[PDB]
Enzyme design. Structure first.
Site, PDB file in Angstrom:
ATOM      1  N   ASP A 427       4.384   7.488   1.646  1.00  0.00           N
ATOM      2  CA  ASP A 427       3.997   6.349   0.808  1.00  0.00           C
ATOM      3  C   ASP A 427       2.638   5.826   1.257  1.00  0.00           C
ATOM      4  O   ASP A 427       2.116   6.303   2.257  1.00  0.00           O
ATOM      5  CB  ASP A 427       5.058   5.261   0.990  1.00  0.00           C
ATOM      6  CG  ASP A 427       4.876   4.087   0.038  1.00  0.00           C
ATOM      7  OD1 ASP A 427       4.326   4.273  -1.074  1.00  0.00           O
ATOM      8  OD2 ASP A 427       5.268   2.976   0.439  1.00  0.00           O
ATOM      9  N   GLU A 430      -2.925   6.008  -0.600  1.00  0.00           N
ATOM     10  CA  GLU A 430      -4.118   5.897  -1.413  1.00  0.00           C
ATOM     11  C   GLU A 430      -5.471   6.000  -0.657  1.00  0.00           C
ATOM     12  O   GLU A 430      -6.397   6.605  -1.209  1.00  0.00           O
ATOM     13  CB  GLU A 430      -4.046   4.650  -2.298  1.00  0.00           C
ATOM     14  CG  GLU A 430      -2.907   4.723  -3.346  1.00  0.00           C
ATOM     15  CD  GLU A 430      -1.498   4.541  -2.778  1.00  0.00           C
ATOM     16  OE1 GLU A 430      -1.316   3.830  -1.751  1.00  0.00           O
ATOM     17  OE2 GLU A 430      -0.543   5.138  -3.325  1.00  0.00           O
TER      18      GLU A 430
HETATM   19  O1  LIG Z   1       8.311   0.673   1.901  1.00  0.00           O
HETATM   20  C1  LIG Z   1       8.416  -0.482   1.060  1.00  0.00           C
HETATM   21  C2  LIG Z   1       7.895  -0.155  -0.336  1.00  0.00           C
HETATM   22  O2  LIG Z   1       6.579   0.372  -0.217  1.00  0.00           O
HETATM   23  C3  LIG Z   1       5.977   0.693  -1.468  1.00  0.00           C
HETATM   24  O3  LIG Z   1       5.930  -0.467  -2.302  1.00  0.00           O
HETATM   25  C4  LIG Z   1       6.787   1.777  -2.165  1.00  0.00           C
HETATM   26  O4  LIG Z   1       6.161   2.076  -3.415  1.00  0.00           O
HETATM   27  C5  LIG Z   1       8.217   1.297  -2.368  1.00  0.00           C
HETATM   28  O5  LIG Z   1       9.038   2.335  -2.919  1.00  0.00           O
HETATM   29  C6  LIG Z   1       8.796   0.861  -1.031  1.00  0.00           C
HETATM   30  O6  LIG Z   1      10.096   0.300  -1.238  1.00  0.00           O
END
Ligand SMILES: OC[C@H]1O[C@H](O)[C@H](O)[C@@H](O)[C@@H]1O
Ligand SMILES: *[C@@H]1O[C@H](CO)[C@@H](O[C@@H]2O[C@H](CO)[C@@H](O[C@@H]3O[C@H](CO)[C@@H](O)[C@H](O)[C@@H]3O)[C@H](O)[C@H]2NC(C)=O)[C@H](O)[C@H]1NC(C)=O
Ligand SMILES: *[C@@H]1O[C@H](CO[C@H]2O[C@H](C)[C@H](O)[C@H](O)[C@H]2O)[C@@H](O[C@@H]2O[C@H](CO)[C@@H](O)[C@H](O)[C@H]2NC(C)=O)[C@H](O)[C@H]1NC(C)=O
Ligand SMILES: *[C@@H]1O[C@H](CO)[C@@H](O[C@@H]2O[C@H](CO)[C@@H](O)[C@H](O)[C@H]2NC(C)=O)[C@H](O)[C@H]1NC(C)=O
Ligand SMILES: *[C@@H]1O[C@H](CO)[C@@H](O[C@@H]2O[C@H](CO)[C@@H](O)[C@H](O)[C@H]2NC(C)=O)[C@H](O)[C@H]1NC(C)=O
Ligand SMILES: *[C@@H]1O[C@H](CO[C@H]2O[C@H](C)[C@H](O)[C@H](O)[C@H]2O)[C@@H](O)[C@H](O)[C@H]1NC(C)=O
Ligand SMILES: *[C@@H]1O[C@H](CO)[C@@H](O)[C@H](O)[C@H]1NC(C)=O
Ligand SMILES: OC[C@H]1O[C@@H](O)[C@H](O)[C@@H](O)[C@@H]1O
Ligand SMILES: OC[C@H]1O[C@H](O)[C@H](O)[C@@H](O)[C@@H]1O
Length: 850
Positions: A427, A430
């Site tokens: 995650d 970017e």
């Molecule tokens: O890790 C906490 C959050 O991070 C980001 O917002 C992700 O897109 C989401 O899926 C996750 O729950």
């Protein structure tokens, strides 16, 4: 003026950089005509505006070379007045050209390299490249339509388009077909919850353009800089990039599926996922202990809901740090994952890229070791750039540095030694930053403040990310930003291969062109809304055309609170995402299948059961993506391009060639209207798995279908055979069950299908021949298999049921290998012949009836 007589739709903007007055417009040598009501440019280029001139065109063994010369400066700084053009006629389908500064190596995107259908000719002054489709003479590319700009931080290349129908240019919240009505599409990877008109998590500078009659071509600009792509209704397109070079590929098709495969021949065919990766995944932010997490599996199991992979979000970590686990709720984390494995399930967890930088020295190995080895993105004074994300202060790994790759592999292997996780949810890549640029802001230079800033959310390249002038091994972040996610996905793929020795499973938020070679994607922080349910269909289709077929949205939606009705319809449709995960935000109401009323649970269970029945087929579709660059989920227009009614359909989808899904995407509906291409389409509910028409005989028309709350419409195309497998709560269980065929006969009694089968997770299967491949053929009241390859993994597969659709007359006898079968049923109302057999997928059989 004479030269200012340019049709409104064909005016290209001569003030894309700033607000201009009439006097300033005219002093640029441009035309000033206000529109009569971005929009149509009031300040635009006459056909005589200075461009580059072609000189010394020469014909080489690979193609053409030439010099391009600009004599009059543009209004941007640092025009490159002398360029080199190279045109390579690479295959019969692929034309490639580059425009470069012959005096200076400029930043280029790192990429391994892989009569014609095209011809190519050139305009001399103003310079342009013209690409014709040879078969019909249609002009596909014509860059003569506007001036070539090539300045140090501004490249613009324009073309006419062959129709108003164009798709690609991810990632944005949009119909599959993009609007050509003065639309600015911005590619700059950005952590923002999907909203219209915004640059989102990924950037894919590729488009596919449809042509009248159903042919198509594609164009890939191999450039990773911040860019705007401007569509206008003439129709025409302008690429506007902030750096790099113009490196352009044209893919001639002519079929849209061929265009996609040709594009993937350059960027990479999709990776082959493990079979288990196609099962159901379940996650939320807020499963705050192993005990709670264990209860999820327990609750799914007790209510007969399949679940292959349990996930955790940030909850598992020690103070939201990678490669740790807290010693309170997650004290027994290793044992939880070991126990998951004992039951035949897998485990996934979130990994962020940024590394906590604030701990005492010597107390947090990922950082301490990162520092030692120089793995982090650095700033002007050579020190790690420090931002703010979930753990607090963090440094950002540079996944272009080979030493950072080795460090990442090491951190992943060491953590895997403690807790044997089965993949990585990457995650925040970017890369996302909760403050602008760095804790210390950013310097004032031309990279941080460039002469052309694309239409990014926040109006700056530093918004919600790191400084553009920060340093990476290969180049500045300015050039490499749109690759951050991709480079992490490559690093993580390699790390997982080395740690586990089997196929990697990486799901990434941020992506770039070529991502699908290494990893999958989820569409990020979508709201639990009917809007976003509907918008997930075009988005999943888009990513398939971009070679990232392992894609889906958070089932029932991420943000806010789902409703029962929405979560039923989202589970029904989302069971047809190639990547199926229900995921949920920290403060939201629970939305696991077992948390709803009994009727909702039944509908959700049915959706999951049908998905698991279809897994052999889905897996075979992934194999075709992996070996031939096919799509898994595809729009109707990919499969029926010559039917122009399909061109704007994006609330239906196909799995491969043969399975049409027509979801309800609105609250309160008990019916849905979908397009049915020419053909017979059998209702899949007439296949026995463990006024509704049994067959829709379509001429190419819209059809209203009953679709009450318990139903999603799924139809099987006549002429196709689909392999199915018996039930299980996991793929560990399901893969051991008997298989079946669903055989959809044409009117003339024909059908064809296939099965690909391997061990579900080993590396180098195709290279080693460790797979079974079988073709099925129905003809003249017989069904046979054809053995393309048969190996140990595949030789145990039991075929126990054959269901034949479109059997007009009740058989007097049904034979399996010449012997009357133990049992069959025929329904005169549905025209379905259902046959019990005891056969083997890997041994030749003949089933017949009369
Ligand atoms: O890790 C906490 C959050 O991070 C980001 O917002 C992700 O897109 C989401 O899926 C996750 O729950
Ligand atoms: C490049 O990155 C480094 C960090 O890797 C930046 O170092 C930071 O520099 C600032 C001052 O410019 C330091 O702030 C100072 O903190 C002390 C207390 O610790 C305080 O007494 C001072 O008044 C001041 O606030 C900051 O601590 C330091 N960060 C770290 C982690 O050491 C550096 O500034 C960056 N360079 C550029 C040009 O951005
Ligand atoms: C287009 O090409 C001509 C001819 O180029 C020749 O000379 C250059 C230096 C190379 O050796 C090339 O292989 C040859 O084909 C260029 O015109 C030449 O330019 C030279 C350097 O300015 C002059 O000294 C020379 O007199 C001149 N030759 C002729 C026949 O005119 C020309 O500059 C080039 N155009 C562009 C825009 O690059
Ligand atoms: C490529 O685009 C250019 C510009 O739109 C076209 O060139 C113009 O053609 C018209 C006649 O059709 C001439 O009157 C103009 O003088 C041309 N303009 C310029 C700037 O050269 C060209 O026809 C297009 N080529 C093809 C093959 O479609
Ligand atoms: C798993 O299911 C159990 C049983 O439905 C849930 O336990 C209940 O939780 C609620 C709180 O929302 C309590 O009011 C009930 O008294 C609990 N019942 C029992 C028998 O314990 C549990 O919350 C579910 N866990 C997860 C993680 O979904
Ligand atoms: C999501 O729900 C929580 C909790 O909501 C609580 O009150 C409402 C009115 C319902 O009765 C729920 O059953 C009950 O649990 C809210 O605190 C949260 O704000 C909400 N989110 C949004 C975006 O509205
Ligand atoms: C179908 O098979 C039967 C023999 O069982 C034969 O009479 C008939 O000609 C066959 N049809 C075709 C088209 O081959
Ligand atoms: O796009 C239209 C706008 O163009 C700008 O360059 C002008 O300064 C504005 O007055 C005008 O409204
Ligand atoms: O041509 C000057 C301006 O005219 C108008 C357009 O909306 C804008 O995009 C352009 O910059």
């Amino acid at each position: 003026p004479t030269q200012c007589d340019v049709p409104p739709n064909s005016r290209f903007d001569c003030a894309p950089d700033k607000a201009i007055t009439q006097e300033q417009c005219e002093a640029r040598g441009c035309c000033y005509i206000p529109a009569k009501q971005m929009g149509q440019p009031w300040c635009f280029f006459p056909p005589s505006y200075p461009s580059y001139k072609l000189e010394n065109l020469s014909s080489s063994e690979m193609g053409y070379t030439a010099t391009l010369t600009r004599t009059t400066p543009t209004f941007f700084p640092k025009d490159i007045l002398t360029l080199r053009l190279d045109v390579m006629m690479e295959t019969e389908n692929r034309l490639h050209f580059t425009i470069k500064d012959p005096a200076n190596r400029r930043y280029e995107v790192p990429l391994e390299t892989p009569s014609p259908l095209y011809s190519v000719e050139f305009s001399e002054e103003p310079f342009g490249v013209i690409v014709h489709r040879q078969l019909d003479g249609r002009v596909l590319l014509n860059t003569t339509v506007a001036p070539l700009f090539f300045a140090d931080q501004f490249l613009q290349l324009s073309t006419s388009l062959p129709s108003q129908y164009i798709t690609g240019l991810a990632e944005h919240l949009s119909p599959l077909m993009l609007s050509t009505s003065w639309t600015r599409i911005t590619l700059w990877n950005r952590d923002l919850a999907p909203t219209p008109g915004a640059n989102l998590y990924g950037s894919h500078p590729f488009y596919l353009a449809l042509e009248d009659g159903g042919s198509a071509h594609g164009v890939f600009l191999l450039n990773s800089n911040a860019m705007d792509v401007v569509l206008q209704p003439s129709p025409a397109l302008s690429w506007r990039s902030t750096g790099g070079i113009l490196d352009v590929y044209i893919f001639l098709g002519p079929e849209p599926k061929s265009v996609v495969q040709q594009y993937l021949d350059v960027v990479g065919y999709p990776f082959m996922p493990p079979y288990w990766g196609l099962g159901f995944h379940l996650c939320r932010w807020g499963y705050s202990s192993t005990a709670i997490t264990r209860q999820v599996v327990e609750n799914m199991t007790r209510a007969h809901f399949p679940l292959d992979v349990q996930w955790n979000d940030l909850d598992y970590m020690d103070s939201r740090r990678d490669f740790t686990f807290n010693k309170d709720g997650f004290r027994d984390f290793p044992a939880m994952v070991q126990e998951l494995h004992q039951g035949g399930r897998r485990y996934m967890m979130i990994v962020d890229p940024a590394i906590s930088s604030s701990g005492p020295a010597g107390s947090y190995r990922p950082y301490d070791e990162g520092l030692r080895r120089g793995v982090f993105i650095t700033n002007e004074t050579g020190q790690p750039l420090i931002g703010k994300v979930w753990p607090g202060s963090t440094a950002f790994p540079d996944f272009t540095n080979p030493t950072a790759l080795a460090w990442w592999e090491d951190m992943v292997a060491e953590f895997h030694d403690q807790v044997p996780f089965d993949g990585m949810w990457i995650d925040m890549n970017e890369p996302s930053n909760f403050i602008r640029g760095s804790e210390d802001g950013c310097p004032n230079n031309e990279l941080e403040n460039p002469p052309y800033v694309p239409g990014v959310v926040g109006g700056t390249l530093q918004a919600a990310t790191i400084c553009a002038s920060s340093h990476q091994f290969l180049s500045t972040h300015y050039n490499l930003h749109n690759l951050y996610g991709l480079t992490e996905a490559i690093a993580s793929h390699r790390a997982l291969v080395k740690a586990r020795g089997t196929r990697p499973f990486v799901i990434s938020r941020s992506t770039f062109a070529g991502h699908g070679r290494y990893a999958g994607h989820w569409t990020g922080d979508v709201w639990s809304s009917w809007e976003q349910l509907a918008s997930s269909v075009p988005e999943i289709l888009q990513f398939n055309l971009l070679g990232v077929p392992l894609v889906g949205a958070d089932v029932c939606g991420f943000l806010g609170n789902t409703s029962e009705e929405l979560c039923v319809r989202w589970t029904q449709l989302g069971a047809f995402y190639p990547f199926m995960r229900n995921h949920n935000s920290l403060l939201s109401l629970p939305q696991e299948p077992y948390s709803f009323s009994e009727p909702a649970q039944q509908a959700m269970r049915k959706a999951l059961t049908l998905r698991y029945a279809l897994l052999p087929h889905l897996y075979t579709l992934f194999h075709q993506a992996h070996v031939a660059g096919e799509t898994v989920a595809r729009p109707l227009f990919l499969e029926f391009p010559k039917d122009s009614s399909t061109w704007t359909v994006d609330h239906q989808l196909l799995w491969g060639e043969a399975l049409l899904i027509t979801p309800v995407l609105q609250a309160g509906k008990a019916e849905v209207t979908g397009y049915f291409p020419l053909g017979t389409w059998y209702d899949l509910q007439t296949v026995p798995i463990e006024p509704r028409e049994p067959a829709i005989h379509s001429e190419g028309q819209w059809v209203t279908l009953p679709a009450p709350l318990d139903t999603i419409n799924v139809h099987l195309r006549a002429g196709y055979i689909i392999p199915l497998q018996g039930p299980g709560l996991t793929t560990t269980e399901s893969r051991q069950q008997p298989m079946a065929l669903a055989v959809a006969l044409t009117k003339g009694g024909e059908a064809r299908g296939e099965l690909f089968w391997d061990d579900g997770e080993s590396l180098e299967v195709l290279e080693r021949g460790a797979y079974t491949q079988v073709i099925f053929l129905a003809r003249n009241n017989t069904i046979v298999n054809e053995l393309v390859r048969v190996t140990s993994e595949g030789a145990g597969l039991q075929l126990q049921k054959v269901t034949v659709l479109g059997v007009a007359t009740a058989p007097q006898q049904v034979l399996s290998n010449g012997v009357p079968v133990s049992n069959f049923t025929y329904s005169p109302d549905t025209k379905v012949l259902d046959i019990c057999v005891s056969l083997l997928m890997g041994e030749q059989f003949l089933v017949s009836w009369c």
